[PDB]
Each structure stands twice: as C-alpha cells, then as structure tokens.
C-alpha cells in the first residue's frame, strides 16, 4: 500500500543535514530553564566591546605589560612622529589578538567599519599636542608634519580632552593596500617643577554597528 | 545571520574513533568505550571556552566497518555483522566483560544493527540536575579542583552481537556528535595559550602577540 | 512522568540467541526453537514482579547473521540467503524437523526474508481467553503448583528456505521483544531473594539489609 | 510515480524507534477488559506509602525480626543518646531496602521530601520523654542533649502521645554532606510495679506528595 | 526534491502484509458476477447446523 519511489541520496549519511532524530530517553522530563544575566544571541555583541592594543609590540618587550604603552618622550621634539600602523584587523600582528581579532579569523570574509580610541595617561599638569592623521587605503604614508596636515586630520591638545575617538569607514581583507594612521608631535609637552618626565599613551579598538562576517571556517591559531 | 549562535556551533564532528574484535585473548578489546566530556574534543573545545554556561541537546551518528583477520583462514561465507550500541545515563550499571548481565538492563537505551544498513542514529536531552552546564568552575568536588559533579553525561558501549565460539573479526566505530537547541551565557576571552591537558586549565606563558620593526613601521603600498 | 508505567515497561530487549545450521547430522541442530514465557528473561522479570495481572500487546524484532563454516571448501558464489520465521499460537501444532508439513499450514503466521534487507517485525495481540496474564498464581494446574494455563503465549520456529542438497552455512538469530500498550494492577514488594529457577519462587534465606558499627554511627561531615 | 528520496537513517534498526508495525494475527478479537481493583498508573503511587525501616542493623542480629526494633532501656539515663542516622534514601544501608529505596535505585536523578514516623510499643503504663533533633545538610552531629537542644527539636512526650511524626525538606543525592536524625533521653522511662522492663520505638519512612526521579537505568540489587 | 528518511523495516518481505501491489494485467476486464445461490460469509453459519454423532463408538 501506498506506491512509493526512492529517489537518489537516499540511505547517505551527510554531515550538514537537518533531518529528525529518535530520542533515546523519552521518559525524561528535563530541567527548567533559569534566566541567568548575560545571555549572548550573536558573536557581533563580543566583537563591539573595546579591548586594548599591543600597539608596542617591538623586540625584548612581548610579555610584559609594557607592550601596551606608546612611549611620550619628554623635551623639545615639534615634528618627530609618535607611532603609525596600518588599519588591517585579523592580518596585521598589532591587531591580531584582540576582541575583534579573534572572531575575524573564524571568518572567510569580513567587512565594516572601525572605531579607535586613543587615551592620555599623563599626570593632570602636562599639556600639549598632537596631530592624528588618517590616509585612505591606496595612498602612502605621509613623511612630515606638514603633508601630514594636507590630507584628513585632527589636533588633538591633552590639556583640555584626555581622549579622542576615531571612526575608520572602509575595511576589509583579500604591500598593503589599506589605510594607516599617524601620530605627529606639534607641540611637545610642558610640565611645572616636581612632575614626573615620561607619559603614555593607551589605544582601545572595538567595532562599529554594521559589520558583517560570511563562510564560517577553521581558525589558524591553534 | 551567520554570526548567530546557532550557525555557529550546531555543526558534526568525528570525537571518537575505537577498535574492538569478535575474539581475542584480552577481554579489553572485545569492546568499545568512550566517557563523554566536552574537554576531550579539541574541534568544539576552544569554540565552547567563549562562554560560561551552555545548554544543548545532543545528536550521535555512528559509522561503522569491518575487516576479517589476515591471519590463516580463508574462504569464509559469512552473514552480515549485528553490532549493538548502548548508552548509560549518568548513574547507571558499567560493564566489565562482553558477557556481563549489564547488557541486558532495562534502563540503558540501546541500538541494534546490522551491515549495509543506513547508519544509526540517537539523540538526548539536556541531562542534568542543574540548569546549565559548566565550562568553567572555581571550586572543589567536596576533592579535585575545577571539577564538579553536575556535568556528568554519560557513556557509551559497543560490542558485537555474535552467537557462541564467533569468527575472528575487528571493528572500528567512528562517533559524530553534533549540539542542537545551543544556549549561552557570560562570554569571556579567548585561550591564548596552547591546551596542556583535558581536564584543568594549566598552560605555560606566551607572548601577548608577534614583533615588527619599529613603532613607526608601516609597509609599502603597492 | 517518567516514573509513569508506559515509560517504565515500554523497552527493548534481547531475550534469546540461538544458532541453526543449514546441513548437519543431528537434525535438531537444523532449526531454532523458542517458547515464549515472561520469566525467562532475567532482564523484565524482576520489573514484572512488582505487579500481579498485566496486560499487554507484543512487538519483536529479528536480527540474523551466517557464516561459512571452515571446513573445506572455498571459491563460492552464493545468492543471498533466505529465512522463515514461523509463529505458533497457543493451540497450533508444533514441528518436529524442518522437513515436516506444519511448516506450512495455513493458520500459523510466517515471514520470509532475505538478507541485506532491513530486519523484520511482527506484532501480537494480547492472546489470552482470561482478561489479564498472572504473573503469581497461588495453586494447581488442574497437577504443576504456581502454573496456570491461561498464561500460553505461544513459540517461535526459524529455518533457512533452500532447495534440496544445500551448502553448509550456520546461522545465528536474536530476537528482540518489546510491549507496549501496558495495564497493571495489584501491586507487591520486590524481590528481595536471587532468582534459583525461571519457574518457581524458589529462593535462600537472605538478610535484610546490610550492617553498619552501632546505632548510633553517622559518618563525618565532609 | 511519486518521486522520492530516502534520507540517512533508512533500513537501520533503532531499539529505542516508535514504528507501526505489521499485526500477525488480524482477524482475532481480543478479550474485554476486565475492571480488577487497585490499578497502578505510576510508580509514585508505591513510594508514597509506609514501610519499616530496619534501624537496628548491626552485627549478629541480620535475619531476625530484631532488626526493626529500637532498645529503650529502663533506669534513669536522662543524657544518653538513643539512635542516630543520615538521610540519604537509595545509598545508606538503613534505607537501601525499604519501599522508597527500591523504586529509588531505578533512576539517577532523583529529589523530593521526606516523612518519618515514630511509634512507640511499651506498655501502657510507661510515661517518659524524648528529643528529637534535626540539623541540615552541611552541619555537624551533635554530640550532647543540650546542643541538640539548640537546633530544630521536638520534645516527644510517649505518655501523652504515641506516634510522632516528621517532614524533612532538601533530600538529593550526587562523608556524607546530608542531614541526619538523633533521638535523646530527655526524662528516662517510669513505671508502676508489676510492668516488664524493656520498651521498643519503631520507625516508618515514606515520602511527600512532590517527589521527581529522571533518568532510568539499570538496578544495582541483583 | 521531498526530503525523505527511510524507517527500519524497509525492503523487507513480511508474510502478513497488506500493500498495494502492481496489476501484471491492466488491460482487461474481468467477468461480472452472477448470483449463484447459497452464499457464506462466516463459518458460523457451517457450524450452526445438525450433524448426526456417532455415538455408538465401540
């Protein structure tokens, strides 16, 4: 009764199927739920949280926490550069670790946009400035002050803000071929007598609303 | 959408591959054996460390082949191989030999089956006391550190269903375990540290990340 | 509603495991035979006893391997093998070798199967004159104490179907039995003896339960 | 006709499956049922009633009606301690074999409550008082009758009263970690002339409306 | 196309079974009944008549 006709894949044990399965305890009746403080619904909730970059991440300092802090020297020093890197999340060594590093290199292909913070860890008498300076994913490295200060910029005084938050539109993956930023002395920094000499300066990378993640994969570090 | 917890984890993988025989002198290798822990498979372990608590139900698929000994007779007519798969709930009876009367209990779920078939399939609820379970504990049994009593799971028992005096013959069972209905909570960081053993949390220090030139080094743009 | 009766019988079971050939000297070793009573099997009967009149439907299944013997010759090329599995209800006639006519009377249910195929199963009624079975009865046949002869459930006959003049194969069947649609009523205490015989109470006195220092002992707190 | 496609999972046999199944004996008309006092429909129903418990159960009286029987001597002993245990159905010796204990080792997860009943067998003529003393999973044995009179207690006064009895809340399973029970010579026994000099306390246990069990196994007793 | 999932007990020849089954004959068209007399539709209605004992069995 009730002609039927089997059709090819029939009796295959394919891994990605979604098929019925018998339960193997019934007479079970399980455990209620219990609503425990933070539930996550989706791996963008941990990738849009801030986490700290090893931004000094030079020979002789790899495990201590000196890594994390961007050496401000003191003196007279108005066109020196502070530091500069590519904006390269997943690839690049400096942003490779961090919060939203590490959920990039589950995926195949990513793209969104990015927000940096940057941060003044002096003492309250020190003041200053400094120029921030972006360049679009196609254009060099500037090599002064000034043509620093032809393309975008910002002059950022620690005097009057202890931070400044920066949104980076265009970011993706495949000497380079993507943006840098830039961090150029203006000024340099004055201190009154009985001040300690150097400061620092702490860098937060998190990710913007819309970012998008396709081809679920195997992660390369382990 | 693909960042969803549920295409993030509800995905098969081989945990278990085993080798038992229909005759033998050991009495060991007459059967197969697996506790089931979710720290013994390196696949879905690192994915699971991303959060605290977890509550899934679970799916297992069995693959299953058979080869006759090389060792002196041939010419044989054999029938096709009956294999029974039995699954103890956490607290119930273990066997010790293939001809042991726990076998034959009414409370463990089992499976028979037999070659050239479909391959077998069960599935099981969330089995616990408590209302998650633990990927993280800081505490005592009552006394062994980071273990607790609530992520019992059970085991898993294969034999062959022969009658008395068998023909010689090895087996090898592959076990595909796969998480439905996956809820999280707490999500913490991720092991930046290569896993030492499969029950504590031990490792040795790494650096934090990889070095570059300078602070300033930027690579050309090509 | 795990503890409710339903889910507390309704269970498979290997109840019997017998090997038949297909040519031999003996002629009883041709064909595999098996009465059906509920106090056979170690495995459902100590769940029985906790109950006196029971009621139920019955589900078996069959699952059957053969081999070539190791005598002398080699180089075969058989077909796939065929089997009968005969049922006899209580009050049909019984066969004595696998030659003779009841094989093929009309009001005995019979399967014939091939292998390779997926194993058969058949259902029976609840096939008593009397409206319940009686798992205890205090009295005569008509003369055996504690049998009755309205708990006649009937047997069990498997052969292979060849021509005439076979090549020798021997076979192995377990059956696998399961009820459902399960009624109880009057209950008892347990068995607190081990079982001596499968057709009496027959037993050794036992003590209580086990001892302990004094009465007043509790273990330490942990 | 009718194109098809046959999943994984075809032609396996699966013991613990729900299938229709082919009837062997259609045309049979069952017996009506029969309505037979004291049907069971779930194994609750056995557990919530009252057994003895075999309190006394030390070395030498094993297989006597002595295991039931808790001594009360005369004379004036108003300090001494009379009998102590845990609480811990289906693992201690002292409830192991009871109604409760036996339904209790068919399953592996199991919570609910408790009552306990006391009843003392003297003669008439006998007055006297008692103290029973109840402390909580995690706490300490007392070791006097004026500590055990600082926790929960209950004064039993057996000249106006015969019977007392108890509700125990928080009982699961997993030196012991559990609750436990002591009884406490509060006066000592008084008499007229012409009385016998021992008395007996015996002890019922059974358990509360709410009582769950999960996960069905195999019983450890035979 | 109609996702499907084979059962146990597929492929096998069970002895009571009650399937569809193909017509080897389709094309053609069978006799029409006629009303034969004395028609059984139960065994009851053979055993609910005399018969005559042979009691003098010796």
Redesign the interface.
């Known amino acids: 009764g009730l002609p039927v006709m089997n059709t090819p894949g029939s ?3 394919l ?2 199927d979604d098929f019925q ?5 019934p007479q ?1 009746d ?5 609503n ?11 990738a849009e949280v801030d986490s700290v970059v ?6 002789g300092k ?2 201590t926490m000196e ?1 994390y802090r ?2 401000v020297q003191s003196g007279n020093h108005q066109s020196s ?1 502070v ?4 904006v390269q999340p997943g690839l690049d ?2 942003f ?2 961090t ?1 939203l590093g ?1 959920i990039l290199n ?2 195949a292909h990513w793209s969104g946009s990015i927000k940096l913070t940057f941060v003044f860890c002096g003492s309250a008498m020190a003041t200053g400035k400094f120029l921030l300076a972006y360049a679009p994913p ?4 500037p090599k002064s002050r000034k043509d620093a200060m032809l393309g975008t910029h910002i002059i950022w005084d620690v005097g009057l803000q202890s931070s400044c938050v920066l949104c980076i539109p265009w970011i993706s993956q495949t ?3 993507a943006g ?1 930023v ?1 961090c150029w002395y203006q000024t340099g920094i004055v201190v009154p007598a009985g001040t300690p000499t150097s400061c620092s300066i702490m860098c937060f990378v998190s990710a913007c609303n819309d970012f998008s ?4 994969k195997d ?1 390369p570090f ?1 | 959408s ?4 549920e ?2 984890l509800c ?2 993988a081989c945990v278990y591959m085993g080798e038992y025989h229909t005759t033998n002198t050991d009495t060991s290798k007459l059967f197969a054996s697996w506790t089931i822990n979710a720290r013994r498979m ?1 696949q879905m372990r ?1 994915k699971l460390e ?2 605290t ?1 977890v ?1 899934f139900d679970m ?1 297992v ?1 069995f ?1 299953i082949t058979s080869k006759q000994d090389q060792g002196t ?10 294999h029974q798969i039995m ?7 273990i066997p010790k030999s293939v001809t042991d ?2 076998w ?11 070659e ?17 379970y633990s990927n993280f504990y800081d505490g005592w049994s ?1 006394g062994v550190y980071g273990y607790n ?1 609530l992520n019992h799971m059970g085991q898993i028992y294969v034999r062959h ?4 005096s068998p ?1 010689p013959m090895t087996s090898t069972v592959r076990m ?1 375990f796969k998480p439905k209905h996956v ?5 913490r ?4 540290c ?2 030492k053993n499969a029950s504590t949390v031990n490792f040795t ?18």
Chains 1, 4 share one sequence.
């Open positions: 009796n295959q044990f891994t990605s399965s018998p339960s193997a305890m079970f399980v455990t209620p739920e219990l425990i403080p933070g539930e996550v619904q989706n791996l963008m909730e941990i090893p931004v000094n991440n030079v020979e790899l495990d890594i961007i050496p550069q530091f500069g890197f590519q060594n400096v490779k670790h919060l590490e589950y995926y196609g254009a060099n490295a000497y380079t071929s840098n830039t993640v396709r081809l679920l992660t382990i | 693909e960042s969803s917890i295409n993030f995905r098969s390196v690192r991303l959060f608590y509550r799916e698929t693959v007779q041939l010419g044989q007519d054999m029938p096709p191989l009956t699954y103890i709930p956490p607290g119930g009876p009367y726990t034959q209990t009414s409370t463990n779920p089992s499976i028979f089956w037999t050239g078939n479909a391959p077998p399939r069960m599935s099981i609820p969330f089995i616990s006391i408590g209302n998650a009552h009593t269903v022969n009658g008395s023909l595909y809820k999280v909570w707490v999500p960081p991720p092991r930046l290569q896993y220090p790494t650096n934090i990340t990889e070095k570059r030139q300078s602070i300033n080094y930027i690579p050309e743009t090509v």
